[PDB]
Design a protein around this motif. Structure first.
Motif, PDB file in Angstrom:
ATOM      1  N   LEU A 178       0.820  -1.198   0.000  1.00 25.04           N
ATOM      2  CA  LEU A 178       0.000   0.000   0.000  1.00 25.04           C
ATOM      3  C   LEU A 178       0.863   1.261   0.000  1.00 25.04           C
ATOM      4  CD1 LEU A 178      -2.665   1.481   0.130  1.00 25.04           C
ATOM      5  CD2 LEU A 178      -2.597   1.087   2.683  1.00 25.04           C
ATOM      6  N   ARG A 179       1.959   1.263   0.750  1.00 25.67           N
ATOM      7  CA  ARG A 179       2.855   2.420   0.801  1.00 25.67           C
ATOM      8  C   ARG A 179       3.492   2.648  -0.565  1.00 25.67           C
ATOM      9  NH1 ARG A 179       2.986   7.144   1.916  1.00 25.67           N
ATOM     10  NH2 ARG A 179       1.728   6.414   3.680  1.00 25.67           N
ATOM     11  N   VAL A 180       3.944   1.564  -1.213  1.00 24.87           N
ATOM     12  CA  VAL A 180       4.524   1.690  -2.561  1.00 24.87           C
ATOM     13  C   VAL A 180       3.458   2.169  -3.542  1.00 24.87           C
ATOM     14  CG1 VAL A 180       5.696   0.529  -4.457  1.00 24.87           C
ATOM     15  CG2 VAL A 180       6.316  -0.024  -2.098  1.00 24.87           C
ATOM     16  N   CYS A 181       2.239   1.649  -3.431  1.00 26.43           N
ATOM     17  CA  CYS A 181       1.136   2.111  -4.271  1.00 26.43           C
ATOM     18  C   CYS A 181       0.929   3.640  -4.142  1.00 26.43           C
ATOM     19  CB  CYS A 181      -0.142   1.370  -3.914  1.00 26.43           C
ATOM     20  SG  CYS A 181      -1.554   1.887  -4.916  1.00 26.43           S
ATOM     21  N   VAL A 182       0.790   4.116  -2.906  1.00 31.91           N
ATOM     22  CA  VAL A 182       0.550   5.532  -2.644  1.00 31.91           C
ATOM     23  C   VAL A 182       1.695   6.401  -3.137  1.00 31.91           C
ATOM     24  CG1 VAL A 182       0.607   7.043  -0.569  1.00 31.91           C
ATOM     25  CG2 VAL A 182      -1.160   5.252  -0.838  1.00 31.91           C
ATOM     26  N   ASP A 183       2.931   5.911  -3.010  1.00 29.13           N
ATOM     27  CA  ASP A 183       4.107   6.679  -3.417  1.00 29.13           C
ATOM     28  C   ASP A 183       4.479   6.523  -4.885  1.00 29.13           C
ATOM     29  OD1 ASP A 183       4.313   7.518  -0.783  1.00 29.13           O
ATOM     30  OD2 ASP A 183       5.895   6.077  -0.286  1.00 29.13           O
ATOM     31  N   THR A 184       3.772   5.668  -5.632  1.00 30.60           N
ATOM     32  CA  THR A 184       4.127   5.421  -7.034  1.00 30.60           C
ATOM     33  C   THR A 184       3.016   5.781  -8.000  1.00 30.60           C
ATOM     34  OG1 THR A 184       5.533   3.621  -6.277  1.00 30.60           O
ATOM     35  CG2 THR A 184       5.021   3.655  -8.622  1.00 30.60           C
ATOM     36  N   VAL A 185       1.781   5.374  -7.686  1.00 27.24           N
ATOM     37  CA  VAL A 185       0.662   5.601  -8.566  1.00 27.24           C
ATOM     38  C   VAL A 185       0.175   7.038  -8.436  1.00 27.24           C
ATOM     39  CG1 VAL A 185      -1.579   4.785  -9.289  1.00 27.24           C
ATOM     40  CG2 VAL A 185       0.071   3.146  -8.362  1.00 27.24           C
ATOM     41  N   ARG A 186       0.023   7.693  -9.560  1.00 25.65           N
ATOM     42  CA  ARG A 186      -0.464   9.073  -9.621  1.00 25.65           C
ATOM     43  C   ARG A 186      -1.879   9.180 -10.196  1.00 25.65           C
ATOM     44  NH1 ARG A 186       4.406   8.650 -11.335  1.00 25.65           N
ATOM     45  NH2 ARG A 186       3.776   8.763 -13.539  1.00 25.65           N
ATOM     46  N   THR A 187      -2.322   8.124 -10.907  1.00 26.57           N
ATOM     47  CA  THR A 187      -3.654   8.032 -11.451  1.00 26.57           C
ATOM     48  C   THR A 187      -4.628   7.534 -10.354  1.00 26.57           C
ATOM     49  OG1 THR A 187      -3.050   5.905 -12.347  1.00 26.57           O
ATOM     50  CG2 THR A 187      -2.756   7.842 -13.807  1.00 26.57           C
ATOM     51  N   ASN A 188      -5.921   7.522 -10.660  1.00 27.15           N
ATOM     52  CA  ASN A 188      -6.936   7.187  -9.650  1.00 27.15           C
ATOM     53  C   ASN A 188      -7.065   5.694  -9.465  1.00 27.15           C
ATOM     54  OD1 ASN A 188      -7.485   9.873  -9.081  1.00 27.15           O
ATOM     55  ND2 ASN A 188      -8.681  10.008 -10.949  1.00 27.15           N
ATOM     56  N   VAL A 189      -6.617   5.187  -8.316  1.00 24.11           N
ATOM     57  CA  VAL A 189      -6.644   3.751  -8.066  1.00 24.11           C
ATOM     58  C   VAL A 189      -7.544   3.415  -6.887  1.00 24.11           C
ATOM     59  CG1 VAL A 189      -4.472   3.782  -6.742  1.00 24.11           C
ATOM     60  CG2 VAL A 189      -5.256   1.644  -7.815  1.00 24.11           C
ATOM     61  N   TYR A 190      -8.502   2.517  -7.148  1.00 21.58           N
ATOM     62  CA  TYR A 190      -9.501   2.029  -6.204  1.00 21.58           C
ATOM     63  C   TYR A 190      -9.078   0.631  -5.837  1.00 21.58           C
ATOM     64  CZ  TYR A 190     -12.145   6.101  -7.305  1.00 21.58           C
ATOM     65  OH  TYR A 190     -12.565   7.413  -7.436  1.00 21.58           O
ATOM     66  N   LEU A 191      -8.531   0.489  -4.656  1.00 24.21           N
ATOM     67  CA  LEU A 191      -8.018  -0.763  -4.137  1.00 24.21           C
ATOM     68  C   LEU A 191      -9.099  -1.569  -3.454  1.00 24.21           C
ATOM     69  CD1 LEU A 191      -4.757   0.698  -2.616  1.00 24.21           C
ATOM     70  CD2 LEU A 191      -4.887  -0.747  -4.653  1.00 24.21           C
ATOM     71  N   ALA A 192      -9.220  -2.837  -3.851  1.00 25.01           N
ATOM     72  CA  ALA A 192     -10.145  -3.773  -3.230  1.00 25.01           C
ATOM     73  C   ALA A 192      -9.311  -4.743  -2.390  1.00 25.01           C
ATOM     74  CB  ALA A 192     -10.906  -4.527  -4.313  1.00 25.01           C
ATOM     75  N   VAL A 193      -9.570  -4.797  -1.075  1.00 19.85           N
ATOM     76  CA  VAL A 193      -8.858  -5.676  -0.162  1.00 19.85           C
ATOM     77  C   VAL A 193      -9.877  -6.680   0.317  1.00 19.85           C
ATOM     78  CG1 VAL A 193      -7.587  -5.855   2.015  1.00 19.85           C
ATOM     79  CG2 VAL A 193      -7.241  -3.868   0.503  1.00 19.85           C
ATOM     80  N   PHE A 194      -9.688  -7.937  -0.058  1.00 19.67           N
ATOM     81  CA  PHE A 194     -10.648  -9.000   0.248  1.00 19.67           C
ATOM     82  C   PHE A 194     -10.825  -9.267   1.740  1.00 19.67           C
ATOM     83  CE2 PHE A 194     -11.337 -13.731   0.550  1.00 19.67           C
ATOM     84  CZ  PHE A 194     -12.665 -13.699   0.197  1.00 19.67           C
ATOM     85  N   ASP A 195      -9.711  -9.341   2.446  1.00 26.55           N
ATOM     86  CA  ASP A 195      -9.700  -9.702   3.858  1.00 26.55           C
ATOM     87  C   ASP A 195     -10.063  -8.506   4.756  1.00 26.55           C
ATOM     88  OD1 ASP A 195      -8.913 -12.035   5.616  1.00 26.55           O
ATOM     89  OD2 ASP A 195      -7.797 -10.349   6.506  1.00 26.55           O
ATOM     90  N   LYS A 196     -11.149  -8.619   5.578  1.00 33.23           N
ATOM     91  CA  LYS A 196     -11.598  -7.520   6.462  1.00 33.23           C
ATOM     92  C   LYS A 196     -10.555  -7.136   7.499  1.00 33.23           C
ATOM     93  CE  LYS A 196     -14.399  -4.500   8.538  1.00 33.23           C
ATOM     94  NZ  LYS A 196     -14.235  -3.037   8.233  1.00 33.23           N
ATOM     95  N   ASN A 197      -9.984  -8.129   8.184  1.00 34.60           N
ATOM     96  CA  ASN A 197      -8.974  -7.875   9.194  1.00 34.60           C
ATOM     97  C   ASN A 197      -7.748  -7.172   8.594  1.00 34.60           C
ATOM     98  OD1 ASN A 197     -10.513  -8.915  11.468  1.00 34.60           O
ATOM     99  ND2 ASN A 197     -10.209 -10.975  10.606  1.00 34.60           N
ATOM    100  N   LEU A 198      -7.357  -7.559   7.359  1.00 34.66           N
ATOM    101  CA  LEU A 198      -6.252  -6.886   6.679  1.00 34.66           C
ATOM    102  C   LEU A 198      -6.639  -5.471   6.291  1.00 34.66           C
ATOM    103  CD1 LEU A 198      -3.488  -6.683   5.447  1.00 34.66           C
ATOM    104  CD2 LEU A 198      -4.371  -7.778   3.392  1.00 34.66           C
ATOM    105  N   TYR A 199      -7.853  -5.281   5.758  1.00 36.43           N
ATOM    106  CA  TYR A 199      -8.333  -3.946   5.397  1.00 36.43           C
ATOM    107  C   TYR A 199      -8.254  -2.983   6.620  1.00 36.43           C
ATOM    108  CZ  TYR A 199     -11.509  -0.131   4.470  1.00 36.43           C
ATOM    109  OH  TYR A 199     -12.039   1.128   4.365  1.00 36.43           O
ATOM    110  N   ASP A 200      -8.763  -3.459   7.771  1.00 37.44           N
ATOM    111  CA  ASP A 200      -8.736  -2.640   8.987  1.00 37.44           C
ATOM    112  C   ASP A 200      -7.317  -2.310   9.427  1.00 37.44           C
ATOM    113  OD1 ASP A 200     -11.521  -2.668   9.045  1.00 37.44           O
ATOM    114  OD2 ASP A 200     -11.673  -4.151  10.684  1.00 37.44           O
ATOM    115  N   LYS A 201      -6.394  -3.271   9.313  1.00 39.06           N
ATOM    116  CA  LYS A 201      -4.999  -3.078   9.668  1.00 39.06           C
ATOM    117  C   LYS A 201      -4.343  -2.062   8.714  1.00 39.06           C
ATOM    118  CE  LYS A 201      -0.883  -6.216   9.836  1.00 39.06           C
ATOM    119  NZ  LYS A 201       0.027  -5.577  10.834  1.00 39.06           N
ATOM    120  N   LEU A 202      -4.669  -2.151   7.419  1.00 35.19           N
ATOM    121  CA  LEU A 202      -4.127  -1.236   6.411  1.00 35.19           C
ATOM    122  C   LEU A 202      -4.604   0.191   6.691  1.00 35.19           C
ATOM    123  CD1 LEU A 202      -4.660  -3.458   3.284  1.00 35.19           C
ATOM    124  CD2 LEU A 202      -2.489  -2.606   4.076  1.00 35.19           C
ATOM    125  N   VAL A 203      -5.903   0.346   6.995  1.00 35.99           N
ATOM    126  CA  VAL A 203      -6.443   1.685   7.269  1.00 35.99           C
ATOM    127  C   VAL A 203      -5.881   2.265   8.579  1.00 35.99           C
ATOM    128  CG1 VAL A 203      -8.571   2.960   7.820  1.00 35.99           C
ATOM    129  CG2 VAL A 203      -8.529   1.342   5.884  1.00 35.99           C
TER     130      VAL A 203
END
Length: 164
Positions: free
Chosen positions: A136-161
């Motif tokens: 996610l950090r590499v995504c935020v620091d690399t992608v400049r276009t509009n990216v909608y990330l889908a995270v399947f795992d709820k526990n991982l999603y909460d940890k990422l946020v």
């Protein structure tokens, strides 16, 4: 358009969602596949996207590989999105379980910059073995276009946020 996403930055959004279900609902211009160099969509996100296409993604991919050879780790190709999207951008993130250089993750995310908006998974996460927080950090620091990330795992999603 995309609904229920949490905005992380100017251009990166995230949602706890099954990317196959998200693609069927939205039918985005581009859905990103977590591909391998052979485009063998056996498991993880690739297996799930391919199964949703009734194997049409795999048939198209086998013809692509027969003509062009394998992709590079960090590379991509644009193929049909079938019933999921207009296009599928097959992006190969390094597979840490296959011993691939994690520094290729930035090159993999650079492929997203060729598309104004994408529905995507976190590259090299899941069965590819990389730390999703790092992805996610590499995504935020690399992608400049509009990216909608889908995270399947709820526990991982909460940890990422909660750790962003």
């Amino acid at each position: 358009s995309f609904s229920g996403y949490l905005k992380l930055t100017d251009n990166v959004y995230i949602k706890n969602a099954d990317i196959v279900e998200e693609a069927k609902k939205v039918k985005p211009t581009v859905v990103v596949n977590a591909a391998n160099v052979y485009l063998k969509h056996g498991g993880g996100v690739a297996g799930a996207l391919n199964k949703a296409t009734n194997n049409a993604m795999q048939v198209e991919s086998d013809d692509y590989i027969a003509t062009n050879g394998p992709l590079k780790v960090g590379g991509s190709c644009v193929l049909s999105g079938h019933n999921l999207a207009k296009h599928c951008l097959h992006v190969v993130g390094p597979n840490v379980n296959k011993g691939e250089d994690i520094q290729l993750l930035k090159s993999a995310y650079e492929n997203f910059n060729q598309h104004e908006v994408l529905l995507a998974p976190l590259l090299s996460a899941g069965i590819f073995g990389a730390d999703p927080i790092h992805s996610l950090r590499v995504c935020v620091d690399t992608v400049r276009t509009n990216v909608y990330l889908a995270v399947f795992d709820k526990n991982l999603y909460d940890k990422l946020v909660s750790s962003f």
